[model samples]
Target: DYIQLLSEIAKEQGFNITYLDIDELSANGQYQCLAELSTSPITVCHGSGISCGNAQSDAAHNALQYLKII
Candidate 1:
């Protein structure tokens, strides 16, 4: 549900919501996720959490806040 929401808002604004595994970027497990809303310049918003799902939601919320979608 959250992913769909973020995707729709981002896609319309010429951006895409993407996720990154914490382990993929670094070995730090404290932050298990990193979701990015990116465009031409890349990475308009970023969010972190103890788990993937939580982090994704965080990122979506942050993105939408900056996006200002009703």
Candidate 2:
């Protein structure tokens, strides 16, 4: 839900948001995800989860928080 929401906000804001999932797992065997926004300063946010999909969602959530959209 967070990932989709961020995409919607990005569309409205006319910027692109990309996610980079780490190929390697974390020390605790969790998936790590990074979200980058195509803003003037290129904002980046980090998040982790037990699964890849959740990690992406978490990353998007953090991005939305940082952007103060929610």
TM-scores for all candidates? 0.55, 0.77
- lDDT, model 1, position 46: 58
Candidate 2 matches the true fold with a TM-score of 0.77
The alpha-carbon deviation from the true structure for residue 34 of candidate 1, after best TM-score superposition, in angstroms, is 3.3
Residues 1-70, model 1: lDDT tens digits: 7777867866677776567755554334534445554544565455766664666677667766764653
C-alpha lDDT of all candidate models, in order:
0.62, 0.76
User: What clash pairs does model 1 have?
Assistant: none
Worst 10 residues of 1 by lDDT: 24-33
Question: What are the RMSDs of all candidates, in order?
Answer: 4.2, 2.7
Candidate 2: segments with Cα more than 4 A from true spot: 26-28
* Regions of model 1 farther than 4 Å from truth: 24-32, 36-38
